[PDB]
A paper describes a structure:
The apelin receptor belongs to the G protein-coupled receptor (GPCR) superfamily, comprising nearly 800 transmembrane proteins that provide targets for over a third of all FDA-approved medicines. The receptor binds two endogenous peptide ligands, apelin and Elabela/Toddler (ELA), proteolytically cleaved from preproproteins to yield smaller, active fragments such as [Pyr1]apelin-13 and ELA-11. Dysregulation of apelin receptor signalling can, therefore, contribute to a range of disease states, and there is much interest in the apelin receptor as a therapeutic target in cardiovascular, metabolic, immune, renal, and neurological conditions.
To further understand the potential implications of the orthosteric variants for small molecule agonist binding, we determined the crystal structure of the apelin receptor in complex with CMF-019. The structure was determined by molecular replacement using the previous apelin receptor crystal structure in complex with AMG305431 as a search model and refined against a dataset including reflections up to ~2.6 Å resolution. Residual electron density maps revealed the pose of CMF-019 in the orthosteric pocket, and that of an oleic acid molecule wrapped around TM4 and protruding into the orthosteric pocket via the large opening between TM3, TM4, and TM5. Our structure showed that the elongated CMF-019 molecule binds in a semi-vertical pose extending from the upper part of the large orthosteric pocket, where it lies at the interface between TM6, TM7, TM4, and ECL2, reaching the bottom of the orthosteric pocket at the interface between TM6, TM7, TM2, and TM3. As a relatively hydrophobic compound (Chrom logD 3.14), CMF-019 makes mostly Van der Waals contacts with the receptor. The binding pocket is also lined by several polar residues from TM3, TM4, ECL2, and TM5, notably including the tyrosine residues Y185ECL2 and Y2646.51 that form hydrogen-bonds with the CMF-019 carboxylic group in the extracellular vestibule (ECV) and core amine, respectively. Whilst it corresponds to the monoolein molecule observed in the previously reported AMG3054 and cmpd644 apelin receptor crystal structures, in our structure it protrudes somewhat deeper towards the agonist, and lines the CMF-019 binding site between sub-pocket II and the ECV. Its carboxylic head group stacks onto the CMF-019 aromatic core and forms a salt bridge with R1684.64, which makes a direct contact with an outer edge of the CMF-019 central aromatic ring.
Numbering used by the authors: 29 to 55, 62 to 134, 140 to 228, 1001 to 1048, 1053 to 1106, 235 to 324
Write the structure that this text describes.
């Protein structure tokens, strides 16, 4: 009685939200993944009224064996396709941070592959799903029959075999790829920011310093950070007109640090602090804006943020489903008490709601991070 309501709520939110996303993308490099996610999320929730009616009828499937096989199959392919599309979107956001449109062709290929690979991994569910009176309650259930692939003493090896494969490909491998993407990109972004943090932190140190040696020490660390940010090539590729302007901006800053460094060496603390404060002028403020703009700093921070929200929304939504399926896999295999077997069984339909929550949450995360979808939806509003 509780679960059917949630299944209905996610059905409306899922098809209206992801329906609005497809309307927009059909009215960039990572835009293949967006439209694939919209159509995977859309097929994922589309047969839920069948399972909402099934759960309401105290687990009694009235729609026959073909709708039991087809409904489960469409859900299971959407299940993998949307995970693989989230992982492909997280990998495309990773490349937009490291590398500098051939990706428009490549993304289409990647999406095509994961769409076939998903429709093939979901094939065992299309095969073993069947309807019959399981555990004799007089109501027919839509269950996965492992008896058509093994004897009584072997149904576990199939249940575990397919179950472990489902979690490995549907959770462990994509989360391992999305975490690797985060760890590499976060490192790269935290390289540019480290040099700019060092510059600002040490300027505060010069302002409050009490002697020339303290001012000299902070200037030395600022000078090494300025040259460190000059060596890191921005997202532009020899001695081109635009390339010289980047290095000249840094040369002004390094020169001003050297000017204060020579005053510090002569023991002129007040004059060195005043010389250091030249970096705060409007002239040097636009040099900072030009150089931080040339590096694509705020634009790469937004890109890293996109990865984190994908990784986390996914880890939070799918962990309960994958933890309880893996725990139940072991409860039946290495036998656990019926107190714990029956717990995992009854908490499992709640795990499918929190996992479904990912599908209808996505249209809002696109609306958050992409102001082009915000402007495409607000024009139609
Ligand atoms: C296709 C139907 C949907 C439900 C709408 N469904 C999904 C995909 C999703 C739909 C919505 C969110 S996830 N996965 C499922 C996994 C099982 C399952 O493994 N049951 C185990 C016994 C067995 O092996 O048959 C026992 C539990 C206690 C572990 C059952 C239904 C599953
Ligand atoms: C098993 C499947 C798990 C891995 C799934 C997807 C990884 C996709 C990474 C490649 C995306 C290509 C992006 C691009 O080149 O534009
Ligand atoms: C050519 C066929 C492809 C080979 C498949 C190998 C990978 C199998 C992995 C997942 C298949 C789905 C298994 C689902 C686990 C049981 C969940 C359920 O009760 O529906």
């Amino acid at each position: 009685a509780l679960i059917p309501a949630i299944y209905m709520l996610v059905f409306l939110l899922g098809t209206t939200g992801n329906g609005l996303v497809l309307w927009t993308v059909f009215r960039r490099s990572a835009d293949i993944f967006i439209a694939s996610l919209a159509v995977a999320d859309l097929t994922f929730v589309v047969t839920l009224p069948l399972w909402a009616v099934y759960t309401y009828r105290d687990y009694d499937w009235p729609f026959g064996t073909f709708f039991c096989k087809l409904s489960s199959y469409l859900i299971f392919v959407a299940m993998y396709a949307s995970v693989f599309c989230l992982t492909g979107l997280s990998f495309d956001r990773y490349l937009a941070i490291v590398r500098p449109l051939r990706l428009r062709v490549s993304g289409a290929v990647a999406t095509a592959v994961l769409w076939v690979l998903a429709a093939l991994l979901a094939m065992p569910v299309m095969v073993l799903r069947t309807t019959g009176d399981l555990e004799n309650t007089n109501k027919v259930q839509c269950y996965m029959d492992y008896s058509m692939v093994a004897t009584v003493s072997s149904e576990w090896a199939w249940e575990v075999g397919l179950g472990v494969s489902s979690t490995m490909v549907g959770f462990v491998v994509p989360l391992t790829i999305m975490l690797t993407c985060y760890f590499f990109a976060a490192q790269t972004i935290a390289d540019l920011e480290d040099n700019w943090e060092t510059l600002n932190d040490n300027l505060k140190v010069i302002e409050k310093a009490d002697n020339a040696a303290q001012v000299k020490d902070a200037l030395t660390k600022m000078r090494a950070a300025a040259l460190d940010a000059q060596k890191a090539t921005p997202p532009k590729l020899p001695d081109s007109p635009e390339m010289k302007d980047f290095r000249h901006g840094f040369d002004i800053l390094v020169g001003q640090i050297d000017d204060a460094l020579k005053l510090a060496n002569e023991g002129k603390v007040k004059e060195a602090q005043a010389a250091a404060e030249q970096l705060k002028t409007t002239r040097n403020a636009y040099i900072q804006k030009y150089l931080e703009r040339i590096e694509g700093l705020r634009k790469r921070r937004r890109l890293l943020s996109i990865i984190v929200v994908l990784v986390v929304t996914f880890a939070l939504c799918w962990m309960p489903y994958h933890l309880v399926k893996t725990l139940y896999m072991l409860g039946s295999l290495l036998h656990w008490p019926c107190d714990f077997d029956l717990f995992l069984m009854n908490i499992f339909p709640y795990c499918t709601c929190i996992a479904y929550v990912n599908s209808c949450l996505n249209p809002f995360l696109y609306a958050f991070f992409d102001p082009r979808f915000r402007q495409a939806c607000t024009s139609m509003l």
